[model samples]
Target chain A: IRCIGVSNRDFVEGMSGGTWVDVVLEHGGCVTVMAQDKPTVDIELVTTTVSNMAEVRSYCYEASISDMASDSRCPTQGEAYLDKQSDTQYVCKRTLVDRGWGNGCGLFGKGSLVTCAKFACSKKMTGKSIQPENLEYRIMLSVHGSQHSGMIVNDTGHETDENRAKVEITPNSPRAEATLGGFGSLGLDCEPRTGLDFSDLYYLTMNNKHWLVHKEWFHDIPLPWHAGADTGTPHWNNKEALVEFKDAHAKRQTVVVLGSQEGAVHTALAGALEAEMDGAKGRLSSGHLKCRLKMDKLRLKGVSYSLCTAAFTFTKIPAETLHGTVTVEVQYAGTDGPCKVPAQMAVDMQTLTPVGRLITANPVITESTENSKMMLELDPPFGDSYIVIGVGEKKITHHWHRSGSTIGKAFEATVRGAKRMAVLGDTAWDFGSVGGALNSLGKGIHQIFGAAFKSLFGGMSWFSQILIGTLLMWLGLNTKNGSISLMCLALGGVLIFLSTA
Target chain B: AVTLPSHSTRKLQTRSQTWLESREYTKHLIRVENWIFRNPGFALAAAAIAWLLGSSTSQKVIYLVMILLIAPAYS
Candidate 1:
């Protein structure tokens, strides 16, 4: 049996290395916990045996106990506590209404229940890619007991129109004759059950008292008789048809689904953005250091640099996160001349003061024609991290002293061409394909003729269709290949039908 | 009145000029073919109108008219 008010972890820790008797006073049952292999016992035998051996003595009275001080102050005016230091107990005032006990009394008590709900994401989810099928969102009931002793009713995110999570309270079973042997023993006409005359659930509202009364705990909401158990039956007693209602008697119990596709998408997007913002920031800073180091190494290799500004253009944008190819162009810049290494380009996420680290600074096949400069292709870091494209280069200067160059020369270098530009990820001046197609189609006809000319052509097509249809039908009447002529005739009839006013 | 004209006043008729002038109708025919290919529905309508107007025409005449009007191209 599950414990009602405390957690299982709390229970086991409180009762470690001890034999205990677990009792349920309301249910009139008890279970014994012994330091051995657990086994089932007879409840009646244990209850009778414990009742007969009732022994009371001084061990109950002669214990270390304390008295409350004469002027000991209580904590607050309307709060409750148990002071173990002074062996004192305190309770707040209760608003007990005047009504019959266990009848319509207004002595209210309530508590809250906590459930564990989780939205699990797959390990494969990344800043660049996320599939919605890799997510699981569910809510489940969690109760306190030994590991295998509690019921778990879970709403694992599946639902239909008529079924959801709800708690239904009702009673069941038939009345029996009075069991007490007597001449005047008769079952009362109103009260039929043993325990309580009726079963009910009630709560007081601000306007009126709400009462949920029923005589059965397992009342079955039956299926429809005629409709093959699709739509529910209109009345409860309608299960007596089809000879009988043969479908399942599904209970009105607890279940619900709280997951949706768009919610998962939004959550995944948030995670991707977080990854890019935090993880990508550190990566960008590290890459910036590498870019500076490469420039310094190139300068040491006697590579004198000239500042060349490049343009980074995104010709294509991805539908999800921001991982796509960018077309990089420079005015006469490549792995040629003094620039023996690839120029560095880094991205800075948008901020008040942005810094760039080299994420893509590797050599690429410099493809270009005679008149054009080098064109390079690279992919920026995923997830909207490409706000500024910063290009870096190093300028090296040689000092020609009075005695130098033959033995050794002093080298001075500075990182230059730290040019940055705020950029839209894709082409800014581009129209969508559908809009461009429509624009081209409309412009051609509008340029060739007036607005009324379209109607003139439309009327001409009507005449054209009638002429074509009549010619095909006439040719179909006298042709060697009857099938071909029939096909032509059908095409002609379609055109004629399409051109009707 | 066979008087000899002055060199400045008389215009020379070259062989290339004569050839170019003679192929004017062919050029016109080629332009018509280009227009027919550019607007295919116009060629279809032309075929239909030719079939409707020419009562003495047979199936061969209609087929040849369609083929001649709407010809595909080569590089």
Candidate 2:
């Protein structure tokens, strides 16, 4: 059979070290062993403020008296002397001799030499309500050296000191059932969803405050949907359907009203401005259109320079025929040289399209002839009464000169040259000699030698010198007494001489 | 009286003139070709030659060389 006993005492007496209790006994004390009997023992103390014996016994058991005694040694007696001094101002300065307390007279035995430089405590709230008026309780433990004890206390005190006590309030679990309803309600609809199309007329205004629907008078209304899982659901008015209503009439502006079993809604909106402009037929003029066409055609033939020509054909609408002379003005941009054509040229519309098919042939000048001017003829009329002036590539300016007097009226025509002028390679002026001479002078001197050299050399080239000389000789020799073959032969002779010289 | 030549004679004359003109033009073309080949620096010489001749044959030849010869040589 097993036996159990309970007693109320400040300290427990035990065997195996029973003689150690004699040190604290009164003078001439004798040990009296109580008989083993089934009786309840009640110990009386002078005051109830004394610690319970069971608690003291449990504390001693937890502390391990043998370990405490082993760690109680000190190097000097200052720790014992401090323990004897006033307890308020006394500080222990002793070192441990062994690993445990030493005979209850040293620093480790009384926990005197151990000073807690820093102390920390933590607690968590476990209640539901976080009302400031509710008195909450938290469990906290205080530690000093190697000794620690815990107690439950009300959390009503404020931290008065920085180092002595620290009470951290942390949530043990997620705060239960908290409501932050009105905190993030403002600016709710500013973030638009993906693929949300807006109306062309219903533009964002008031720095994106509300959707402004253009009525007879413009009226603004707030969007009525949340951004998250509850999008596209109407909350306030039918205002959120404005985007959808505008999309239905996106192509044309008209009022649309649809009725269903649920409800009926009316929406009015406008279409794209580009479609309106297209309906009005607003575009460029015929002359500008023709100019653009000519420019495009010329661009294909390496005429990307400043010599482009633009011609416009204006006609009376009912006649379907060319009208009288119409002035077509061509203004050019992006040109390096001065424009040779007039800013505006008057062109007779009849000249662009002849009245009837007239069989005519002209002698195209052969290269073997000293003079290579093309002779054109309008058959049955039999006269050169028109002159067409064309600008050449070599930067020479010329005007029209009509001939065949007393036969017909003199007609003159001019056309813009290609953007890039085309010149005969054989007619190229040799600048090697001039460039070499200029190079002989310093680089500064060469910079001063300008287009003069280029012009002089250009005038003496194969085309200019031969053609001009042949024309001059032909004019001088082909008089009343001169023959055509004689003029030709003389022109040939002059070419031969000039080339050789 | 500056009577025109007969048909056959005129044809012969036109053919002869054409042949002679072609020959002269060919010589001019040859001169330009030689200048371009010798200089190897003038980029627009072939184009210039074609513009002056105004003959399809000359223009084609020069344009071909410009596309084939001069362009690659400079490059």
Candidate 3:
């Protein structure tokens, strides 16, 4: 669609339906903008002897896996801990609570607290000998809290292997056979968990494992973790991936840099980054970025609006305990326009923490004569820089030069400039040229007459305009008066032209 | 051959370390930042008015407000 000079709100506000909400999955905080239309299954990963599970928790502690596993003492039941070695975290919880001693409650009446310890193991490689093998690991039963106060698992057991089945490893049970190869996962079997505590079970095994355990009751549950969902080959529903559709509506930052009078979009992006950080604790699913307009040669497409297709590209760099800059670029394409504007900034990738200001070269300015093109000329000389909005009589403009350097004097200038623009479309700028003066005079006249007759002419029919133009032209031709003949002919021609158009 | 370094030979302390050590100066800067953040709208509005009046100072202030506004309302 053609848009000459659209407002930031109207342009960005076009996106509606199929809301995009970020869903951060486990392991390195894989942030995803998931659709609200798709039905999802929350298959319970692990359960307690009492069938209790946790979805998320705010307050948690960190502990070294090696130290906790070898220590003589164990953490209290329901206590959460982060693994220092593998970077994985879980909690120590009792399987049977308030049960009689022996069998399920041998260690304590609250049941024997299980610690889902995941560690590298060795397998028999030669005659009566053993060697460190990558595939040897155990998936034990423990607290499973997906996010914070959610279900925890022993990483040793869960794997991406397809044949591995969901099995229960309860207290006082025989030693479970370790997997020679392939994959497996741990979950509760004696009971079922409800929605509040029900988290979709996903298993991560091998070098980069991702899987889920199966249950007879959960046969109707969502499909197991497989290649289809991961590869993004699922049923299409007019989906716009996060990379392709992150804030399709242009934001204020995007507008100001591109010569539009607006800036609320950056505020929203800032909030989005903050939300990701708050939930991930100290990680990000992807780097933070914002896009703006960039064109090779500035062109006034049409009198009313411009219909141009622009490719907005944002670079996403995964954060894994690193610090760097996120580079972004935007491209606008048209009949004669093919250009790009590159931007980037230093940031702590893990948390998307800004370490430096956004950077982009100044826009390549060209000359133009269109009245609406005034914005293009008035566009701040800086790229992706700060701009203060100036609301005048009938127009909204901005100031970038010394935008807010002197509070007292600067504020006065803005108000005066606002009033000047309101009074006569002419700005306070001093352009030493007769054309400039005459051009502004036309603008003043256009604004006055155009606005005055807007409602009246807006409702007039095309037939009425044609009829008036024909009669007026006929009268002018018959009179042939030197003083008023051309005036009538000119006005009649304009009316006829407009009516045909 | 242990030689003592001359005081003049040593580089001056970092600007932030010296300025931040001044209790009054630090407090003033912090108070100013907090106040401006407390009323972001007012700051922008005032800056907008000044810039419109043809004041360069107001334009800079508006820039400052926008740059600072990029940080989530963490206060």
Which prediction has the highest TM-score against the true structure?
Answer: 3
Docking class of 3: incorrect
Summarize candidate 2's per-residue lDDT along A265-330 as a digit string, tens digits.
011111111101111121101000000000111111111224323221111111100111111111
- Decide which is better by TM-score, 1 or 3: 3
What would the TM-score be for candidate 1 when compared with the true structure?
A: 0.13
Residue A206, model 3: lDDT of: 19
| lDDT of all predictions | 0.24, 0.21, 0.24
DockQ of every predicted complex: 0.00, 0.00, 0.01
Interface RMSD per candidate? 33.3, 48.2, 29.1
lDDT of 2: 0.21
In the range A233-294, model 3's lDDT, one tens digit per residue, is: 22211111100111111110000001110122222122121111122121122211111111
